Each structure stands twice: as structure tokens, then as C-alpha cells.
Amino acid sequence: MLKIDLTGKIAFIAGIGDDNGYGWGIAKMLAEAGATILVGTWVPIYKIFSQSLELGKFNASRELSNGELLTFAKIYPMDASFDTPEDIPQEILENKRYKDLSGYTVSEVVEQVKKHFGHIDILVHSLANSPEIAKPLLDTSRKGYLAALSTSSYSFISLLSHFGPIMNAGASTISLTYLASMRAVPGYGGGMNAAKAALESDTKVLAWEAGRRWGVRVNTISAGPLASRAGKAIGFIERMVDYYQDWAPLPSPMEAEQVGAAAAFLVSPLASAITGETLYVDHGANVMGIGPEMF
Amino acid sequence: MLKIDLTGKIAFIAGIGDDNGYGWGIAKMLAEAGATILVGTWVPIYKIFSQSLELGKFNASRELSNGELLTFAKIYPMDASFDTPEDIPQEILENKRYKDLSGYTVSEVVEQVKKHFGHIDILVHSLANSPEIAKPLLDTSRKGYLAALSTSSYSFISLLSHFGPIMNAGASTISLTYLASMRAVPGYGGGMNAAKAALESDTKVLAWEAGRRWGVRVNTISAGPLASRAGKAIGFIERMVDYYQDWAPLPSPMEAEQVGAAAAFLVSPLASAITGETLYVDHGANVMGIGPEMF
Amino acid sequence: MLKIDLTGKIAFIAGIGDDNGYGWGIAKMLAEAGATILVGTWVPIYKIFSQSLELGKFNASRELSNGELLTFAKIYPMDASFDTPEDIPQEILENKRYKDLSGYTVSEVVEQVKKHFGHIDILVHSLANSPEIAKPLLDTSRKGYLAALSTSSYSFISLLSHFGPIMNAGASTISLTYLASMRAVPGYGGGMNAAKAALESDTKVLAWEAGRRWGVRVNTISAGPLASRAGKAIGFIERMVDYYQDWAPLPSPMEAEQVGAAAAFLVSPLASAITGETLYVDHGANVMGIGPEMF
Amino acid sequence: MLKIDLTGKIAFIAGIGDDNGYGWGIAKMLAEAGATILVGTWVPIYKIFSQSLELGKFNASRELSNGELLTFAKIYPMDASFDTPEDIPQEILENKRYKDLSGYTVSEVVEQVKKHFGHIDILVHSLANSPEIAKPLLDTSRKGYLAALSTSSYSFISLLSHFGPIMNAGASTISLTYLASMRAVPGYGGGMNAAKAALESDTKVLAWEAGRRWGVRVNTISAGPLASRAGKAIGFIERMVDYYQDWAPLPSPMEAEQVGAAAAFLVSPLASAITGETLYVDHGANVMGIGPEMF
Ligand SMILES: NC(=O)C1=CN([C@@H]2O[C@H](COP(=O)(O)OP(=O)(O)OC[C@H]3O[C@@H](n4cnc5c(N)ncnc54)[C@H](O)[C@@H]3O)[C@@H](O)[C@H]2O)C=CC1
Ligand SMILES: NC(=O)C1=CN([C@@H]2O[C@H](COP(=O)(O)OP(=O)(O)OC[C@H]3O[C@@H](n4cnc5c(N)ncnc54)[C@H](O)[C@@H]3O)[C@@H](O)[C@H]2O)C=CC1
Ligand SMILES: NC(=O)C1=CN([C@@H]2O[C@H](COP(=O)(O)OP(=O)(O)OC[C@H]3O[C@@H](n4cnc5c(N)ncnc54)[C@H](O)[C@@H]3O)[C@@H](O)[C@H]2O)C=CC1
Numbered sequence A, B, C, D: 001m002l003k004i005d006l007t008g009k010i011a012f013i014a015g016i017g018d019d020n021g022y023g024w025g026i027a028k029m030l031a032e033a034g035a036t037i038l039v040g041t042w043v044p045i046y047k048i049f050s051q052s053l054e055l056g057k058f059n060a061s062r063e064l065s066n067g068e069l070l071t072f073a074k075i076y077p078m079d080a081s082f083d084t085p086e087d088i089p090q091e092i093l094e095n096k097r098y099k100d101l102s103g104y105t106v107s108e109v110v111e112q113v114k115k116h117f118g119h120i121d122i123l124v125h126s127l128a129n130s131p132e133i134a135k136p137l138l139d140t141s142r143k144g145y146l147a148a149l150s151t152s153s154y155s156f157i158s159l160l161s162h163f164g165p166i167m168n169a170g171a172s173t174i175s176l177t178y179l180a181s182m183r184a185v186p187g188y189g190g191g192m193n194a195a196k197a198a199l200e201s202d203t204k205v206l207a208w209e210a211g212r213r214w215g216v217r218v219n220t221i222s223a224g225p226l227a228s229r230a231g232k233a234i235g236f237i238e239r240m241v242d243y244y245q246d247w248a249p250l251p252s253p254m255e256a257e258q259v260g261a262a263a264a265f266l267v268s269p270l271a272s273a274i275t276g277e278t279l280y281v282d283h284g285a286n287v288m289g290i291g292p293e294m295f
């Protein structure tokens, strides 16, 4: 037999806000492979996510092939915009969603993980935001652009920089990107193109640095369109899904567990020679040199 | 549990000549996954390969995790330079090692597979040759350049074209490449650069064509240096292995099974959304923008 | 003033069949810059081209900005499929177009150029053919695929290898490619995708080899769609032209002289630091991540 | 004759602090082509630069081919970190070098140019900085990374956003980048890899956006190493220069005017079909697949 075996491994997944995104899909497949799952959930939705899970609202999505339910060892409120408490502005501190929580900056979450688990094996980054995604880049503000980069790109560096010293041998990371990183996709606004370009560039540089510092592998998955929370909010994700079905080598729609399976493989000992890679899991759409009108 | 399960599937691997190349490594991992293995072996070395196998010469390399030995259901003498018997030059017809054999063109091998097995599930292409690899491309002859393309590139198209109509649902292909395809590597001569460029370009085109025609997936793996038969003949493979260790994000040398494990994943149902991809399994050397002296 | 000054430089342009392709456009712009123009014209259309030129049929297309006419110092019948007369099948020798002519192999043309002009300064490759472009790659024959490679890609190596020894200091080359080389474009069949992938790969390799051997620069231009002879012959070039207008950052249709202007700059002393480059002259269509429908 | 004709065209160059950088080289070549030259100079070094200029310290680097001296029509104090006065932080406002100057935010500078000149034709972005360039990406702070993106990447968007509406027909932009944007170069620290990745991604997106909005073309040049102000502070620029000479297809060192000549071509009417392009002007180093250490 050939197993993707993650038994006893501890994965931290940053960016699970419901059962509809890639983060959930990755969690599910890492669990199928035997991993222990810790979750970073964004502060302003932490209460609702954690409550919905306890109230059984996600149970249809928790079914594992062994009959058991997907279970998280711990869920940490987190805002990966902030490395230390000093970084948090008064506007955030006085926000009612934040004021009733504590220990949610990156350095703080990592210290808690260290206290309770000692080490991690797998770091998964499945988070992105721009406050101005609906704006053309020409019309995107400086603060908006830098916010897109801070949340969507630097957040990875912060997570790896802080978790790195407590990663075990054979540890690796996963982040998620989209092809608009280095090809023009009108509609992907608010500096999100730059944030993904940065994320992909950093994947390569970090593969070398983390590789030489800790022996850690660093890979990114470029996914096709999915009607997640983020996806649905853009306003036309359904048009993108349909377009990809007409465009791609294969017509099947994305499912979060497809990206999850690729992530499981990449963080497993079966991928020890794979690092710095951008792996396309988009039914081959990215290889096309023309749109479906000229087929 | 998460398994890469190929039990009941038939893989045809074109290009196993001994236990020291990537083809053997791929066979071993597909077998670990449960796949039944058919092999195409170059005519002039078919007798020695088959005989050595039966003598137990490769037994140390044959051991599997379950305690079984790697076994081939059938080994076919084959020369992928030829599609039909009408293609074979008189000199080859008169050659000692060809003249007392028959049915070694691509069409003939596929017809024998179809008769005895009906269908295949996985096609692996692990074969390359240029008669002029030591020569700078500037000094490579038309005959040499086209022979490199014929053997190393077109052979994949012939194998997929002939096998495609008998591939089952969920079928996929793997071929092997090297980064000199689209970056200049002095010493990768005799048109091998062009043969690899063509193979990767063909990978994308065939992913669309085979995807739409048969639902077949088509992927390529770009590997790090290995001291195979072909690798040792170039004359400086050990220096290349050493260079990659100094250069890459991770220092581990290539092992055939690392590419085998990648192949096994790519052909499994876990990778249904992956097609047209070039997957680097080279310890990240390919992502570097400068060599080791400037680190 | 800043001039692209090719005064006294001798350019050999392989692939001018009439006034409608990129070869002619390149010739006009090199002529504007002051270059002497030598032409290689495909054997089967050599007489036709020469006779049309003599009857004044292209005179409207010959007007240079200085009031003079685009003038060719010599037009050579050529077939770049053949390096030496020994390579020509008797079947070709007996064809009427070839029987009426002589000295059209690559070696023979270069020998005539050396005899009467001594050296050249610029080599332009503006030729391609596949006998099976209407066929899916899956359905393309070995003979067809290799013929595309021989005519469209090896021909460049042959011309550079033969002309290189008689190139003056500061010499450079230009070839023409299309984005289907490394992205999948259904309809670009007959192995043309592989031929352009090979052409682009060889550009990089030859930049290094010819740069080190003769100080020669080697560049390629990836152009937008044009209704040339070859263009029109695909049967749907007009739809490709219209598609590009809806798709690209800029809407203007290709003109042969746009590519010609890029060629003129790249072969001028102003581009001494540019080599191995693939320069897109396609109104930016190649940078798009989706087609028109999702704008 | 074939002229790169910029007669009467108004060019604004962001990032000239002395005569040793790419900005100066670009100015000189645009001036050779006939352009009027406006310069944006970083506030802290605006006085030293303008005083050095009129003192005649740069007269040796000002000589043009027509026998005239390079002349800046207007030199504007500028800090491209700031879009409007509202953006300026307290420490900067009270700083010795800013506190007496006024109108140095991007919006204010564009307004001055609009009053003075009505419109512009060419925008050159030759600026970059990270306060943490010596630091591994892993050790780079959030403030440092975002500062690198703000100064090196968003600044271009701000300049184009503000300048666009007063750009004439046929207008275009140039920026400068380095290959570390999408390939790992250890030592290009402080988030500069991400800054350049963003710059290049933005080039593609803005080519579409600016192309459709104003008909403006947008291109970037990727240069080899130069001993500039920024280049020398890095601390090993001479080693990089030597490495490139050993590595590249051609051995000549970079000269600022090489990038300048490429820039003049790209902003000229001869390049009307070129947009969104990344043009390498680095003697071909970028196309290499291995380092000099082998060969
Ligand atoms: N959904 C799609 O079509 C595609 C998404 N991707 C990438 O996949 C990743 C995951 O996105 P999805 O699963 O689609 O949506 P998602 O909305 O379910 O997940 C993104 C998460 O980021 C979290 N987040 C936002 N700001 C945060 C902060 N400051 N600190 C901590 N968490 C924050 C959100 O709570 C949200 O849960 C993203 O990187 C996205 O760019 C890639 C390709 C396609
Ligand atoms: N060895 C290395 O460093 C690397 C090899 N690759 C690629 O891996 C693939 C396998 O190569 P290796 O395992 O290294 O060497 P290998 O020598 O073990 O395999 C090449 C096979 O091709 C067969 N072959 C040659 N001409 C044939 C023909 N006309 N008809 C049928 N079979 C023919 C050979 O007999 C041999 O079995 C090749 O495509 C190679 O280009 C890629 C990367 C690195
Ligand atoms: N036309 C278009 O949309 C585009 C064309 N290209 C490339 O531009 C180049 C020139 O093509 P075009 O100007 O468009 O058409 P063209 O038909 O005018 O030029 C092709 C020439 O190749 C010559 N030729 C064919 N076989 C030859 C042989 N065995 N020996 C010597 N010459 C031979 C033909 O006589 C013909 O004149 C080609 O490489 C083409 O692939 C690239 C991009 C776009």
C-alpha cells in the first residue's frame, strides 16, 4: 500500500471561517491522513464560527471516511494583521468583537501553541483580504493596497517566522494563490494581484531561507474558482466557475477537497523533494493560451 | 486513512532498461500503490534486462513495503522511434538484436496490450535519447536534432495517440523532463533542449486534446539530476549532483522513488483536478535566481 | 538625435514570399535604418515572387520614408529544409520548381553570400511550415511533426551555424514565434506548438553558444496575428485578428512594420545588452489571464 | 533613416538623485531623442542634487551627442511615499529637510506639472527602497516589508493614477525591475523580492487598465547589476557585476545608457504594439539555467 500518512502530525490551519472554503477542505483531508488539526480563525468571525460548529451547523461537512467527525484540537482567535499586541490600533482594541478576546496576535497564538503542543509539523495559510477588491488597481488607494499585502502576503511570513523555531524535522507549509498573480485578470482588484504575486515570490525565497534554516519545505497551490465566503463576495464567482468549465482541459468544477488532497500530498514524506513549487489545481485552465471562443 | 490506491489499475511504463533510472523508481511506487505493471524496454537491451531480472540480479532493488517483489506482468521489446513496421530502416531490420524479434513498433505493442489486457489506466514515458548530446546545439546536425525529437518527444505523442482509445475512465499520463527545456544549460546538447521544450509544450496541448477527447489527464515531472544509465553517460553527472546540493533550498540528493511517489500521486484519483502540469521534484533548485557562489 | 542606424550593415532575411508577411515588414524597416537587404525565398514561390517584384506589383509596398524604394541587393532561391544538395530527395529534384533552379540549399546560399558580399551583420528568420497544421497534435504523424520541426526550427540552427563564421562584430539574429509555443492553443496543430517551443528554447541556448563563440546576439519576437500568406492559409486568421482586438490591452491590429521596428531596434547597436530575449509585439494580449467574456 | 523621435514629448522621471543610477541614463537617452525632461527628486537629497547640478559637478555626465548639455526643464522635490498632504506623518512634517519645502506629495507634484506644462507624454519610474534590504525575508519586519512595497511598488500606481488623466495620446510608462521578483536571490532582502514581484504584476494589470482607460502603454525593464547609489550601499555590487560577466551569454558590464536606449525605444511610436512587457536588458543572464560554477 501507498499511504499519505500524517498520523501524529500537528497542522495549524490559518483561515477557516466556515465549511465552504479551501481551509475547511484542507482540514478535512489532513484529518483523513491522520493529522491533528489546530485552527486559526479571524477574530471578528471567531464567535460565530465556533458557535456554529458547537451547534452542529457544519455536521454535514464533517463526515470522515472512517465514520468519525472532523474535530479540531483547538481553535485560536487570530488576526494575522498583527504580530504583537503593540501593533494593534485603538480602533481594533475598542471594537466589540476584539475587546472580549485576547492573545490573538501571531506571536501570541504561536506562544499558546508552543505551551500546549510544543511543536507543529504543518503550517497551512488559507487567508486573503483586500478592502478594495472591487476597485480597478488604478483606483485603489495606498492604504487599501498595503492592507491587501499585509493580510494576504506578509501574514504568511509572520506565521512562518514565528512558527519556524518550533517546527519538527520534515515540517512544511502550504499557501493558496490564484493565477492573477502574474497574468492580468480584470476584476481582481484592490491590489489582490500584487498580494498574490508577492505570496508566490515569497514562496520561492522562503523555500530557500526556511529550507536552509530549519529544513522546512514551502509550497503554494494555485486553485481554480470556488464559491467560498470570499468567492461569493466578489459578486460573480458563479460566472467564473462556468467560464472555467468551458475553458479548461477538464470540465469538472473545483471542490475544496481537491485542493485538500494536493495539500496532504505536499506536506507528506512522499513530497520531501518538492519545495518552492507553485502547483496548479485548476483542471488545467492555467495552461490555456486562448479563451473558449476560438476553440 | 488517506491512500494512493491503484489496485486493479494497469500502468504501461515506456523506458525501463535497468534498476538505476527514474522508470524503475516509478514502477516501484506504482506497484506499492497496487498497480499492475507493463513495461516497454528498448530492443537492444531487452534480452539482458529480462534475463538479469530472471537471474535475480535486481532483487535488492525489487523489495516492496508489503514484502512482495516488484513484478512486471509483461515486458515488451519496443523501439519508440517506430510507429509501424514500414518506419523501420533497412539497417535496423538487418541488425542482430532486431532481426530475431517482431512486433516492437508502437502500434504493434499497443495491439498486443489491447488483445491480452483490453485497456490501460496509466501511461508513463521515461525515455530520452540524442545521438549528439555531447555536441553544442550550434554543431548538432539536422539528423541528430530530429532524432532527439523523434525519440524523446514525438514518442510520447505516438504512445498516447495509440493507447488513448483503450484507456479507461480516470486515465492519466506522466512524462519526464528537465529544466534545460526553457533555460539555457551548456552541455545539454544534441537538441535535447528542444526535445524537452517540445515535450513540455506538448504536455499542455495534449492535456486539452486528450482531456476533451477521452477525459485523460496529462502531466510532466521535471526532475533533479540522477546517476542513471543516461545520466552516467553524459560524463559529469556526479559534479551535477554535487552542484545541486550546494545550490538548492534542500541538500538531499535525488532518489528515483521521489519522482515515483510524485507520479503515483499524479495518476491517482487524488489528483483529478491536476492536468497539463509541470511538477518540479528537484529539491527546489529550479526556483533559484542565482548560483551558490553569490549566496 | 537618437537613430537606429544600420548603415552599411548587410542583412539576410530568410522567408520573404510577397509583401504581406512579417519578412517584408522587417525588410522595409531594416531598409529605413540604412541596411542592405539580401533575401532568401522559398523555391516553389521564388519565380512567382521575383516576377511580381519585376512587374511593379509590390511597388506601393516598397516606398520608404526617404522617397526611395525598398531594394533587394540579391534574392536567393532557398529551401531551408536542406543543408547540402545530398540531402535533397530525388522526388524533390524532379519537381518542376526545383528542377529549373540550382544552388538553393543552406550551404550553397551561404557560399554565394560569402563570395559576393564577404560577410553579413544581421540574420532574420521569418519562415515556418507544417504539412499538418489542420490536425490536432494527437492526430499528427511522426513525419508531419518532424517536418514542422525541420522547416520551422532546425532551419534557424542551420542558418546560424553556416552564416556565423562570416558574421562581423556586433552581429545579431531575429526569429519569429507565437504564444502557442508554451500555452495551449487549439488549432495550432501539426506540431507547430512544438516547433515554436523548440525555436524559443534554441533562442536561449544559441544566445549563449553564439554569444560566446562569435559575440553574436540572438533574439526572438512573439507577434500578434497577421493575415500573411501563412496566416490566411489557416482558414480563420480574420477571427483571430478580431479576437485579439477584443482581448488585448490595446485594440489596434498588427502591422508587419510594428514587428519590423522591433527587429530594427534589436539588431541595432542600441540593443547590445539584449540577447536571448523573447519580445512580445502583440498589443499585450499575451499578458492576459482570461479572455474577453469575463471582462 | 530610422529615428527614435521624441521631439516635443514631455517626460517626467521619478527617481534621479545623482548621475550614477539608471534614472540618469534614461534621462540622457530620452534627451538624445528630443524629449523635454522633468525630474522628481527625493526630498532629503533634492537640495544637494540641484546644487551639485548648477555647481557643474555632473557636467561630464551631461554631454549629449548633438554637443549640447542635458538640461532638466523643472526639478521637483518629491516623496512618492505620500499621495496627499493628509498622508504625511508628524516626524516627517517637522523634519529639517521637509519642513521648509512644500508641494512634494504625488498629487501636488502632478498639479504643478499640469499648471506648468498642461500634459505629459512619458512617465519613468526609477525608484526603490527597503529599509531592511540586508535582512533575510524571514527576519524582515511588517513595517519594513510594507515600506518596501509602498516606496517601490505602490508609488508607480500613484504616479500613473495621478498623471494618467493629463497624459497625451500615445503616452507610455517605464519602470525598472530585477529578476529576483520571481526567482529566489538570497540577499535581496527586506521584501524587495515582493516589491519587484508586485511591480511586475502591476505592469500587466495596469497595461490593460491604463490601455483601455487612456490608451496608455505600460512596460517594465529588468536590468543587470549597476554600481549606483542604491547598488553600492548593498555592499557586494562589484561581486555581482563580476558574477554576471562570468555567467551571461555576453560579458560586457551594464551601462546606464543601455537601459536608457531600451526605454527610449519603448516610449517611442516605434513600439506602439508593445505593452505590458518585461524586457530584459542584462546581457542575457536571465535565460541561463545553471551558474558559471559549472559550464
Ligand atoms: N475562492 C476562490 O475562488 C479561490 C481562493 N484562493 C485563495 O484561497 C484562500 C482561501 O480563500 P477561500 O477559501 O476562498 O475563502 P474564505 O473566506 O473561506 O477564507 C479566507 C479567510 O481569511 C480570513 N481572514 C481574512 N482577513 C484575516 C486576518 N486579518 N487575519 C486572519 N484571517 C483573515 C477570513 O476569515 C476567511 O475565513 C485565499 O488565499 C484565496 O485568495 C485561490 C484561488 C481561488
Ligand atoms: N537522469 C537524470 O538526471 C534526469 C533524467 N530525466 C529524464 O528522465 C527520463 C528517464 O531517464 P533516465 O532514468 O535518467 O535514464 P534511463 O537511461 O534509465 O532511461 C532512458 C530509457 O530510454 C530508453 N530508450 C532510449 N532510446 C529508446 C528508443 N528509441 N525506444 C524505446 N526506449 C529508448 C532507454 O533504453 C532507457 O531505458 C528521460 O526522459 C530523461 O530525459 C530528467 C531529469 C533528470
Ligand atoms: N502570421 C501570423 O499571425 C503570425 C506569424 N508568426 C510567424 O511569423 C513567421 C513568418 O510568417 P508570416 O510572415 O506570417 O507568413 P509568410 O507565409 O509570409 O512567411 C512564411 C514563409 O516561410 C517560407 N517557407 C516555408 N517553407 C520554407 C522552406 N522549407 N524553406 C525556406 N522558406 C520556407 C514561405 O515561403 C513563406 O514565405 C513565421 O515563423 C510564423 O510562424 C508569428 C506570429 C504570428
Ligand SMILES: NC(=O)C1=CN([C@@H]2O[C@H](COP(=O)(O)OP(=O)(O)OC[C@H]3O[C@@H](n4cnc5c(N)ncnc54)[C@H](O)[C@@H]3O)[C@@H](O)[C@H]2O)C=CC1
Residues within 6 Å of the ligand: D014, D015, D016, D017, D018, D020, D021, D022, D023, D041, D042, D043, D045, D078, D079, D080, D081, D125, D126, D127, D128, D129, D151, D176, D177, D178, D222, D223, D224, D225, D226, D227, D228, D229, D230, D231
Ligand atoms: N542598481 C542596480 O543593480 C539595479 C537597479 N534596478 C532598479 O533600478 C531602479 C533605480 O535604481 P538605481 O538607479 O540603481 O538606484 P538609485 O539610488 O540611483 O535610484 C533610486 C532612487 O529612488 C529614490 N527614492 C528612494 N525613496 C524615494 C521616495 N520615498 N520618494 C522619491 N524617491 C525615492 C532615491 O533617492 C534614488 O534616487 C530601482 O527600481 C532599482 O530597483 C534594477 C536592476 C538592477
Ligand SMILES: Cc1c(CN(C)C(=O)CCc2cnc3c(c2)CCC(=O)N3)oc2ccccc12
Residues within 6 Å of the ligand: A128, A129, A130, A131, A132, A133, A177, A178, A185, A186, A187, A188, A189, A192, A224, A225, A226, A230, A231, A233, A234, A240
Ligand atoms: C477566482 C477569483 C476570486 C477569488 N480569489 C482567488 C480570491 O483571492 C478572493 C479574495 C478576496 C479578497 N478580499 C475580499 C474578497 C475576496 C471579498 C470580500 C472583501 O471584502 N474582500 O476573485 C476574483 C476576482 C476576479 C476574477 C476572478 C476571481
Ligand SMILES: Cc1c(CN(C)C(=O)CCc2cnc3c(c2)CCC(=O)N3)oc2ccccc12
Residues within 6 Å of the ligand: B128, B129, B130, B131, B132, B133, B177, B178, B185, B186, B187, B188, B189, B192, B224, B225, B226, B229, B230, B231, B233, B234, B240
Ligand atoms: C541532469 C542532466 C542530464 C540528464 N538528463 C536530464 C537527460 O535528459 C539525459 C538525456 C540523454 C539523451 N541522450 C543521450 C544520453 C543522455 C547519454 C547517452 C547517449 O548516448 N545519448 O544531462 C545533462 C547534460 C548537461 C547538464 C545536466 C544534465
Ligand SMILES: Cc1c(CN(C)C(=O)CCc2cnc3c(c2)CCC(=O)N3)oc2ccccc12
Residues within 6 Å of the ligand: C128, C129, C130, C131, C132, C133, C177, C178, C185, C186, C187, C188, C189, C192, C224, C225, C226, C230, C231, C233, C234, C240
Ligand atoms: C496566429 C495563428 C497562426 C499563424 N501563425 C502564428 C503561424 O505560425 C502559421 C504557421 C503555418 C505553418 N504551416 C502552414 C500554415 C501556417 C498554413 C499553410 C500550410 O500549408 N502550412 O496559426 C494559428 C492557429 C491557431 C490559432 C492561432 C494561429
Ligand SMILES: Cc1c(CN(C)C(=O)CCc2cnc3c(c2)CCC(=O)N3)oc2ccccc12
Residues within 6 Å of the ligand: D128, D129, D130, D131, D132, D133, D177, D178, D185, D186, D187, D188, D189, D192, D224, D225, D226, D229, D230, D231, D233, D234, D240
Ligand atoms: C542587483 C542587486 C541589487 C540592486 N537592485 C536590483 C535593487 O533593486 C536595489 C534596491 C535597494 C533597495 N533598498 C535599499 C538599497 C537598494 C540600498 C540602500 C537602502 O537603504 N536600502 O540588490 C541586490 C541584493 C542582492 C543580490 C543582488 C542585488
